Amino acid sequence: IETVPVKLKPGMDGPKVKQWPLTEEKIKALVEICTEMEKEGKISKIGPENPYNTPVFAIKKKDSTKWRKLVDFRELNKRTQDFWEVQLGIPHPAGLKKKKSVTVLDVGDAYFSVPLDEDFRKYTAFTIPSINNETPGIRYQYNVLPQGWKGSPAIFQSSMTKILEPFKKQNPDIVIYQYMDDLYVGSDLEIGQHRTKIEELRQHLLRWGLFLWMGYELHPDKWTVQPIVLPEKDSWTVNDIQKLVGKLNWASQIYPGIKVRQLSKLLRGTKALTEVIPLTEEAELELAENREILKEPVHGVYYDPSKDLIAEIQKQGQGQWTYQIYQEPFKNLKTGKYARMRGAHTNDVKQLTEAVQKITTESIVIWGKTPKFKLPIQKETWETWWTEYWQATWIPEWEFVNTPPLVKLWYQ
Amino acid sequence: MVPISPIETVPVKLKPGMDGPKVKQWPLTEEKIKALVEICTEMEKEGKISKIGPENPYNTPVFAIKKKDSTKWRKLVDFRELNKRTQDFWEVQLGIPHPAGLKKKKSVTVLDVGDAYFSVPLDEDFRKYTAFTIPSINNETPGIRYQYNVLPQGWKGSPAIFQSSMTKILEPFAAQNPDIVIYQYMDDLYVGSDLEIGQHRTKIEELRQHLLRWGLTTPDKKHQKEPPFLWMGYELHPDKWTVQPIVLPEKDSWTVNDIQKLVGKLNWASQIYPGIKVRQLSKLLRGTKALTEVIPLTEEAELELAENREILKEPVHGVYYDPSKDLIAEIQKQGQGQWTYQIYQEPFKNLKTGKYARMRGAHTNDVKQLTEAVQKITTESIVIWGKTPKFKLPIQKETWETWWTEYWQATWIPEWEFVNTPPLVKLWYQLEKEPIVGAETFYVDGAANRETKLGKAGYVTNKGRQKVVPLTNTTNQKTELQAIYLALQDSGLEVNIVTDSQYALGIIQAQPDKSESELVNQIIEQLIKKEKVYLAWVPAHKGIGGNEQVDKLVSA
Numbered sequence: 027i028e029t030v031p032v033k034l035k036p037g038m039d040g041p042k043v044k045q046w047p048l049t050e051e052k053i054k055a056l057v058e059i060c061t062e063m064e065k066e067g068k069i070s071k072i073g074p075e076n077p078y079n080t081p082v083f084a085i086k087k088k089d090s091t092k093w094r095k096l097v098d099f100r101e102l103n104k105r106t107q108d109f110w111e112v113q114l115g116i117p118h119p120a121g122l123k124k125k126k127s128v129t130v131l132d133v134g135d136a137y138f139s140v141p142l143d144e145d146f147r148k149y150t151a152f153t154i155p156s157i158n159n160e161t162p163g164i165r166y167q168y169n170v171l172p173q174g175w176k177g178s179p180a181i182f183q184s185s186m187t188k189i190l191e192p193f194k195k196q197n198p199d200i201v202i203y204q205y206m207d208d209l210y211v212g213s214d215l216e217i218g219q220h221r222t223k224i225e226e227l228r229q230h231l232l233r234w235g236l237f238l239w240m241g242y243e244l245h246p247d248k249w250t251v252q253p254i255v256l257p258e259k260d261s262w263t264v265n266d267i268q269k270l271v272g273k274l275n276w277a278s279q280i281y282p283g284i285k286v287r288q289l290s291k292l293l294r295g296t297k298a299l300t301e302v303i304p305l306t307e308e309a310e311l312e313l314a315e316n317r318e319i320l321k322e323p324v325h326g327v328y329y330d331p332s333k334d335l336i337a338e339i340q341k342q343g344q345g346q347w348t349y350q351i352y353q354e355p356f357k358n359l360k361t362g363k364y365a366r367m368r369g370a371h372t373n374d375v376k377q378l379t380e381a382v383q384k385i386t387t388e389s390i391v392i393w394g395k396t397p398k399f400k401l402p403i404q405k406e407t408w409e410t411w412w413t414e415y416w417q418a419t420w421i422p423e424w425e426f427v428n429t430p431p432l433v434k435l436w437y438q
Numbered sequence: 439m440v441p442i443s444p445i446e447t448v449p450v451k452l453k454p455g456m457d458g459p460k461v462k463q464w465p466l467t468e469e470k471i472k473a474l475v476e477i478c479t480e481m482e483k484e485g486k487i488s489k490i491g492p493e494n495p496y497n498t499p500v501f502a503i504k505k506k507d508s509t510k511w512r513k514l515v516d517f518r519e520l521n522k523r524t525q526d527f528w529e530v531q532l533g534i535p536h537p538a539g540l541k542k543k544k545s546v547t548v549l550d551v552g553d554a555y556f557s558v559p560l561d562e563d564f565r566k567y568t569a570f571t572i573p574s575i576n577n578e579t580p581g582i583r584y585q586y587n588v589l590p591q592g593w594k595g596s597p598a599i600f601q602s603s604m605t606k607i608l609e610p611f612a613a614q615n616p617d618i619v620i621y622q623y624m625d626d627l628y629v630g631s632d633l634e635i636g637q638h639r640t641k642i643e644e645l646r647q648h649l650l651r652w653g654l655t656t657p658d659k660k661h662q663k664e665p666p667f668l669w670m671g672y673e674l675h676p677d678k679w680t681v682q683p684i685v686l687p688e689k690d691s692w693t694v695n696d697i698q699k700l701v702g703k704l705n706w707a708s709q710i711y712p713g714i715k716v717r718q719l720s721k722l723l724r725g726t727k728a729l730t731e732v733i734p735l736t737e738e739a740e741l742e743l744a745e746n747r748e749i750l751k752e753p754v755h756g757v758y759y760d761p762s763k764d765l766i767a768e769i770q771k772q773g774q775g776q777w778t779y780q781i782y783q784e785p786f787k788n789l790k791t792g793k794y795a796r797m798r799g800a801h802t803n804d805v806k807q808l809t810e811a812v813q814k815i816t817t818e819s820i821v822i823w824g825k826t827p828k829f830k831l832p833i834q835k836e837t838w839e840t841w842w843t844e845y846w847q848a849t850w851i852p853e854w855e856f857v858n859t860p861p862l863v864k865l866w867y868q869l870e871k872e873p874i875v876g877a878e879t880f881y882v883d884g885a886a887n888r889e890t891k892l893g894k895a896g897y898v899t900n901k902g903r904q905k906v907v908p909l910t911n912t913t914n915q916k917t918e919l920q921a922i923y924l925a926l927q928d929s930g931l932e933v934n935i936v937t938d939s940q941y942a943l944g945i946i947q948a949q950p951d952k953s954e955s956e957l958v959n960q961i962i963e964q965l966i967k968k969e970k971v972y973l974a975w976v977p978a979h980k981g982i983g984g985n986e987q988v989d990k991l992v993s994a
């Protein structure tokens with residue numbers, strides 16, 4: 027009922043983005059899903075007069091036996107007008123990240139209840155390819171708000187508010203945040219109590235006519251950071267001291283008051299790398315003064331909503347990964363390390379793809395938007411494999427680091 | 439009469455802000471006009487075009503062209519201007535099937551759909567833009583004005599609109615007859631199956647009846663096209679496929695042109711003929727682009743050519759795909775950044791072959807190239823078969839594990855097994871993770887004057903060993919590498935090296951086994967001879983001893 031008019035940005039045409047190759051099982055899953063969607067009126071076949079395309083694939087979400095259609099709308103989303111008239115953008119709740127439990131629901135199915143503006147539908151065109159291109163790819167466009175599109179939460183926001191209105195007044199201490207196809211619900215209650223309340227919310231959705239049953243549990247109050255820490259040792263080798271001086275030199279770009287002068291003095295001579303050097307008093311004081319500095323927050327760090335977030339990741343080995351989220355170099359908004367390995371133990375690329383998902387999630391909770399990634403992987407390796415491991419309903423932007431960073435050492 | 443279902447028209451627009459073409463009609467000879475008038479009269483009778491009134495402002499030029507050893511004429515409309523102004527369409531004809539992805543068929547029949555080809559209705563609102571003018575005899579009358587009612591040959595949207603229309607009417611037949619395949623190419627339909635011959639011919643007749651519902655007649659006659667088919671540079675046979683004949687010329691003198699053609703043939707051949715190599719021949723095309731320039735063949739190119747001639751000596755065929763069997767991909771290193779592969783299901787019968795060439799860059803190694811080759815084959819295989827083959831690779835499992843666990847980048851290759859087929863890919867050196875006890879420590883450094891290009895490189899060690907060498911025509915980065923080289927050259931089998939060079943660390947941490955830089959190559963050669971090497975970095979100008987001493991020495 028009553029479509030909202032949508033436009034692209036001035037001077038921009040719609041996306042024409044190549045469909046990448048899909049495995050037989052993904053094609054079969056999509057044929058099946060789309061046949062049902064077409065029957066339900068969600069999508070319609072299109073003709074050759076529609077030149078546009080956006081890539082599509084299929085994923086298996088967390089703990090699930092069935093495929094989910096995932097459209098990569100990144101190009102369309104850039105080309106789509108921002109959303110203004112009623113909505114200025116919603117002030118991002120700062121309390122969401124402070125909650126004890128945040129559960130993430132996929133609410134994207136609700137979007138299918140709102141018709142998409144008839145003039146904008148052509149820009150949602152997508153193709154189901156055939157193996158070896160032996161039959162013409164199947165061409166569709168959306169008749170309703172598609173999952174993954176920037177415009178969907180914006181347009182649906184009016185309907186969503188009414189649906190959650192009784193729940194929010196009945197539960198005022200709860201933060202509800204919506205990003206893309208996700209709904210983030212925080213609470214400080216006992217996890218059993220938290221869960222029942224999540225299911226309470228689900229019923230609010232279902233009763234209004236309609237992967238909802240799922241939930242993904244976060245505990246952002248437990249999220250921890252990485253201050254710069256220095257070794258505490260009884261005996262320092264020449265090599266230990268060189269490593270120390272190297273690490274401090276790096277740190278001094280972040281923290282101005284850092285001094286290496288006295289420590290470097292210990293290095294004077296030409297000495298075997300493994301020889302033990304006793305610290306001088308001046309060296310110990312300097313090291314001590316440095317430790318104190320490093321217990322402090324970084325000076326002049328601030329988030330600017332008008333700037334991109336940048337995320338860098340280092341492979342540390344043994345399934346360990348470190349990462350930093352920043353706007354300007356050396357002013358880190360967040361840092362972190364992932365140890366925990368869910369499968370992935372023989373696969374670097376699966377690990378990286380999961381790190382990428384966790385970092386984006388953290389980014390959405392804290393700032394309400396996704397970072398641009400600098401990935402320590404070759405483009406061709408990433409592009410071939412990442413879709414096999416992707417469980418998220420959104421996708422961030424990335425670029426590729428081909429030169430090994432020296433600073434890996436110091437986030438270790 | 440029997441009612442037929444109409445073909446729904448595809449709505450068409452000009453690009454935004456653009457109007458239709460207005461292009462002057464060329465004068466023509468009296469006989470060409472007469473022949474065009476005759477042609478258009480007939481076309482008009484068939485409903486393909488209609489005469490229009492004076493009010494249509496649009497025009498596209500029309501020509502008459504000889505039948506070449508016949509007396510008859512054909513109408514050519516030059517749609518270049520209208521095409522510029524016509525919207526883009528979805529192009530389905532990209533994504534050509536690869537023969538190695540096809541399934542064997544007992545029977546393949548061809549049907550002539552040529553009468554549908556020129557009869558597809560054109561969107562009513564767009565017709566005005568197709569206006570053309572037969573010039574009048576002596577130009578003493580107004581030219582005869584026509585517009586198209588059907589997709590004109592040569593117009594931008596005709597192939598896409600004809601393809602989409604045909605697919606749409608074929609869909610229910612395909613869907614309800616899963617036991618055949620149907621493919622449209624130009625004005626033909628190709629129908630394959632495994633059916634007993636009687637059942638196959640029945641399917642063909644049913645297809646003809648189906649098409650009849652849209653008024654599309656196909657000739658009762660037996661089509662002149664039979665397997666084998668010459669298609670897109672291939673020969674397709676019922677149970678096998680190949681590339682059309684590849685014959686390499688003998689020449690005592692070769693030009694740029696002949697080399698591009700030679701490389702093209704070899705590239706085309708490489709998808710079935712195993713082991714084809716283009717490296718040395720492709721080189722001769724570096725730079726230049728003056729086309730008629732004759733290039734002398736290097737001995738290396740001559741050898742590559744001779745090797746290719748041997749491979750191409752007798753025909754080789756690929757088999758088709760059997761979905762019930764695993765795909766296997768095997769890869770061999772050929773040298774000079776070249777890799778070759780075979781994809782098969784049963785031993786000794788390839789579906790297809792192919793090659794991969796090392797990417798351009800300052801430094802590289804075999805493991806990285808092998809990995810890239812694997813990703814390329816993977817992607818190709820997804821396109822053709824919709825799945826990843828199992829790989830057989832000339833690299834030991836232990837070598838791979840040592841590589842990926844220690845490499846600074848995330849890296850992965852899918853399910854694979856070692857095949858012992860020299861030359862094997864191996865790690866030529868690995869650096870220590872910890873400083874070596876009992877190993878001499880070399881503090882290295884180098885520096886150069888950016889103006890004079892004069893420099894020094896050298897080292898000092900914990901044993902008081904020292905060297906400084908004067909250098910000409912060098913740079914800071916080069917002297918930094920030179921210093922590492924000297925320490926490697928002058929030390930024993932185990933060595934600790936301390937450098938301040940972020941540049942050198944960047945290169946060495948990338949683990950190259952080969953480089954375009956002569957110096958990096960010498961460094962690699964030295965590393966290969968060591969038992970243990972620990973490379974330690976420190977920041978410059980910090981008063982770190984032995985680094986400052988050697989920095990002072992080399993800074994002149």
Ligand SMILES: Cc1cc(/C=C/C#N)cc(C)c1Nc1ccnc(Nc2ccc(C#N)cc2)n1
Pocket residue numbers: 160535539540541542543546619620621623628629630665666667668669674675676677758
């Ligand atoms: C792409 C294609 C080109 C031609 C024809 C193009 C032309 N000219 C004919 C057909 C029927 C097809 N389509 C498919 C689809 C699946 N398997 C096959 N196998 C197959 C095709 C031809 C022969 C033969 N001989 C053997 C097996 N063909």
Ligand SMILES: NCc1ccc(OC(F)(F)F)cc1
Pocket residue numbers: 444445553554555557558559600601603604605607652653654
């Ligand atoms: N109206 C006659 C006609 C013209 C073309 C046809 O083939 C088509 F399917 F459109 F490609 C089918 C029928």
Ligand SMILES: [Mg+2]
Pocket residue numbers: 883884885938978979989
């Ligand atoms: Mg120096």
